[PDB]
Enzyme design. Structure first.
Site, PDB file in Angstrom:
ATOM      1  N   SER A 146       1.410  -5.120   3.598  1.00  0.00           N
ATOM      2  CA  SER A 146       2.552  -6.040   3.499  1.00  0.00           C
ATOM      3  C   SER A 146       3.833  -5.497   4.176  1.00  0.00           C
ATOM      4  CB  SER A 146       2.881  -6.299   2.009  1.00  0.00           C
ATOM      5  OG  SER A 146       1.735  -6.289   1.171  1.00  0.00           O
ATOM      6  N   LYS A 161     -13.008  -5.336   2.199  1.00  0.00           N
ATOM      7  CA  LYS A 161     -12.977  -5.185   0.759  1.00  0.00           C
ATOM      8  C   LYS A 161     -14.107  -5.978   0.059  1.00  0.00           C
ATOM      9  CE  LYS A 161      -7.981  -4.510   0.626  1.00  0.00           C
ATOM     10  NZ  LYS A 161      -6.793  -4.544  -0.258  1.00  0.00           N
ATOM     11  N   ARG A 174       1.547  12.400  -7.703  1.00  0.00           N
ATOM     12  CA  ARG A 174       2.031  13.567  -8.457  1.00  0.00           C
ATOM     13  C   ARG A 174       1.132  13.846  -9.665  1.00  0.00           C
ATOM     14  NH1 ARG A 174       6.427  16.154  -6.964  1.00  0.00           N
ATOM     15  NH2 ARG A 174       8.213  15.142  -5.933  1.00  0.00           N
ATOM     16  N   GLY A 211       1.388  -4.889  -2.641  1.00  0.00           N
ATOM     17  CA  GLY A 211       2.149  -6.080  -2.286  1.00  0.00           C
ATOM     18  C   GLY A 211       3.576  -6.132  -2.799  1.00  0.00           C
ATOM     19  N   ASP A 263      -3.595  -3.355   7.116  1.00  0.00           N
ATOM     20  CA  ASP A 263      -4.246  -4.557   6.630  1.00  0.00           C
ATOM     21  C   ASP A 263      -3.856  -5.683   7.553  1.00  0.00           C
ATOM     22  OD1 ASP A 263      -4.866  -2.699   4.632  1.00  0.00           O
ATOM     23  OD2 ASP A 263      -4.245  -3.969   2.964  1.00  0.00           O
TER      24      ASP A 263
END
Lengths: 273, 262, 262, 273, 262
Positions: free
Chosen positions: C218, C63, C147, C135, C11
């Site tokens: 991030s 996005k 999982r 974030g 990002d």
């Protein structure tokens, strides 16, 4: 539509001041005719937890040909095919009745689709007006059917009478929110309001057991009375039938109300719950 | 299954009843255990089905318990026209229905709502019926189920192309069948009413609400006059939009079944 | 989409970051609004995407808000390699996702469980990622989601043919895709991990759990040394089964992003 | 009555495909006019927990004489005297608005008593129809006013759109119970149903912040858009104003929607709750 | 009290305000404590009332605490035109109001509903006002109270002779006054609106709903232009059915009081 509604209204007005009586057989019909009943309402003849349906047309045909007064029958709520069948039989009025077993738990019959006028039941003004909106030509209180106890009818009569005279008071602004509170059509609310009463003939029903019960309902402003168990379960059906008619025709004359109440016999036993 | 449109299927416990049904114009009979009050209700003995099948030339149907794929394998061998995986018998598997795709015999299953219907079709049913409320002679639940399904179908049919996904997740139903249902504007298999039908008036009512036919059982053989009741229900279903005929086959019917209101 | 296997998508808020990503070996960049605290998070200005796209030759992604099919039409015109219908932006339609079948640009969507994944694929997604917890720099939710999905897939894959129907009703997922999922023994589209990845160790962990790649944001650009962090995450993803190499690209990394534990 | 309703309907149709914009001063009005707005809606200029009332007529007079596009104002719900005052001022339309402080917690203005057409808000079909029943000539969604978040508008648009297409499916029997469920008048339900849509002009409002928000609402079938904070709280009000108009006039052309979205600046910051 | 019909009573804290009121055409002033935030609110010092009374020739009113019959005896000595037993001061007796029959000075009391009104009249009030919501500049509670009372009155007025008894028991009100209320078709004393009135539009609204006049306080002296606000409210009350005049006295009023919505 407009005209077919006016036509049914014209016809039901004929019933004002009358007593309609519930009958199970010819002997009962005859008693009713003899007493001054403007009509009879035919019921299943039961000698149990049964499903109660509209009666066999043949049994209606058999009773109707032995009298000359009006003949009414019951259908199950939301059962439009039972109504279609009785329409074809040329009965005078149908009662979409909560005393029979409901056929549809959400919808009532669309009564605009029939030539035969309908009567329906109510306990309050919104309910009455929704039945008229669906096409009923006449209304009755539900009362408490078969108990011989007048208390619920009285309550239902007083509830509609108030909401009607109050509605008549409200300002042109307030009438909308009241319409939404009654969940009733604003058109028929406004009409109740320019007529100063219920827009169709309105009879008491359920629990009437003495001449005194009948006249009370008339003194409270009803147009007439249905009676069933009060007559045919009394000690003297014939005398009780005639006294109730007299009372309805003379509901403001205490002296006649006395007179027709002397030596009447035992009234229906009844059920207080 | 398309053959069955406009017909009445009747539940029979023995040959006498089966003949009354055939004589009436029933397009099929559904064979039941003959009971003389809890107690486990299972598949009928194949012998009994075989005895009845041989005395009639209309279609023959039997019931298996929900989830009981071995009762179904046994009746499959027997070459019956249709099986009904039926909630009226005692369920055998509380989580899974029979995988009906593994049979050559068509299945019929019940439903009370569109999602259930479509799950049954996904499992392989070739026909659907409402559940109504069996053995009560009260039509009210059947009407509820018919209306619930009709509405959800017509609603579905209006929905914009993007809204169908979330609806399919609420019906808990396959999107293929949902899209097919919306392209046919109705249910993608033959669809009958069942449970509670006790008069000609009741049978016509289901037909006027869009059903393809009717199943009746107790309403005939617990009425006063089973032969006359059965014949009138057949006429009614064939003539459901003709009120003059619906009057005529209701005159002098005798007493309908007593029923039970709960 | 199959091209993307074994890669890292990063990002970026501007060209400097985009170049760091390209230099690291990222197979694509995901372009974000550049913010200097509630506040509505929408599609980026197309101009900004255009400025960045022209300064790199790796793949470019943007996005759109959940349900916002017009933001998607606008970016579709712009000829981007992929859109992400993303829960990290402010939802636009609380009931319906975009109908992704009406675009030529492939979509990626998030999930926390198999049923959600499969609903998104039914709606037309070409790729799936976990939601993790974006974030935060905390890997725990991503692991949970990876999982949860892996188990439900392997369980599904064992189920007998008749049991699949009721499971499909519990996943609230289409049976076609469920059956395909059980025939591939995995998810029927490319499937990446996302949200919380802050170290090479974190990225390799998702890969050791069967993921096809990773999204990171991030964790790179809030670390001490974004260029060295970004390059190490790429090596890690490419070498996730080689602990000797995972040691070497973690030596002297500086501080990872601070994060937030809730 | 019949004719005065048709007259107001004729007038509101003029608004289809238009954008009405909320303005606080002349500079804002001018920007709006320049951008292609078919109308402006005048707001209190606020430099606090205050009671929000209809604006001073003088401030409306001042803005109206510096532009030639339509001019609308807000009144408090149920405040029929604020409406009487603005009627006398010859404003083009009134908005009985839930964004101002309610003056009456049970009753809306009876809007049949005015020549000036009204717009009202809704989140669902019963509410819409009750506002029309009271006399509104136009409806808008409530959305979430001032937040720059489109999500509630979308929900409100989808809710009314469904109930409308479903109602259109129901049988003549089922329509009564649905009327009672929506607490709406059967007359207007039947009319929604023979028109296949809302019987009055229907605009989106509350939360529109980008050209893309505006066109989405149009692609969902709305007749137009109100915008306020999205424009005047953006980085470039004028350019944002013009792009939103273009989008509304071209809501099906992705290429224009792109074109008018390039280099727009920052949209309003907004509030997610 | 009948003198007061069609008038405006204004709340004043000093002579300047009192003169603004008189100049406006107020038919009376209601004298208040002059406060520069809990704190007990009591009767004003008689001296202050005396100072103001001497500088005007309109009617003069003061407040006493609910139940405080000694504050009332003190002000009675002072020869004031009217006392208001007021919920805006701190109640002195939480169960009993003053027995107002023991004073020569007429009292005014508040109400939110018909039964309360009639209890106050039974206790000896000569005038009634709504409570509205004092000091907020929000008209909504006043409208509620006006409508609640108007309805109950008109309803009452319809009731059959036997139904009045049970209604009187529900209002918890004396049947004498109930019967008088139904014979006058309105309230048997002068009846004003109060609390929240902040614009000419607000004042006319109460008058259009049947009130005999209005009390205003904060709405004048916290507006931008108290003299112009006060004069416009007077015109409004005198001309409440004339919308052309209601427009004219609202042009260029400045800002109304800010208020508080809760």
């Amino acid at each position: 539509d407009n005209d077919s509604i006016l036509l049914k209204h014209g016809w039901c007005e004929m019933l004002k001041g009358g007593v309609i009586m519930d009958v199970k057989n010819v002997e009962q019909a005859k008693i009713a005719e003899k007493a001054g009943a403007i009509g009879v309402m035919i019921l299943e003849n039961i000698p149990t937890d049964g499903v109660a349906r509209s009666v066999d047309p043949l049994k209606i045909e058999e009773i109707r040909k032995c009298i000359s007064i009006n003949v009414l029958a019951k259908v199950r709520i939301g059962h439009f095919v039972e109504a279609q069948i009785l329409e074809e039989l040329k009965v005078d009025m149908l009662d979409e009745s909560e005393v029979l077993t409901m056929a549809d738990e959400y919808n009532h019959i669309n009564k605009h689709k029939f030539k035969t006028p309908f009567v329906c039941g109510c306990t309050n003004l919104g309910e009455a007006l929704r039945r008229i909106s669906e096409g009923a030509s006449m209304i009755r209180t539900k009362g408490e059917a078969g108990t011989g106890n007048i208390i619920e009818a009285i309550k239902h009569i007083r509830t509609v009478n108030n909401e009607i005279k109050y509605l008549c008071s409200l300002d042109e602004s307030e009438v909308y929110n009241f319409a939404k509170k009654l969940r009733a059509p604003i058109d028929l609310i406004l009409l109740t309001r320019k007529l100063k009463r219920l827009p169709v003939v309105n009879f008491a029903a359920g629990g009437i057991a003495t001449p005194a019960d009948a006249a009370m309902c008339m003194q409270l402003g009803m147009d007439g009375v249905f009676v069933g168990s009060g007559i045919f379960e009394s000690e003297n059906p014939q005398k009780m039938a005639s006294s109730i008619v007299m009372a309805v025709s003379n509901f403001n004359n205490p002296k006649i109300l006395l007179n027709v109440s002397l030596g009447l016999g035992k009234a229906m036993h009844g059920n207080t719950k």
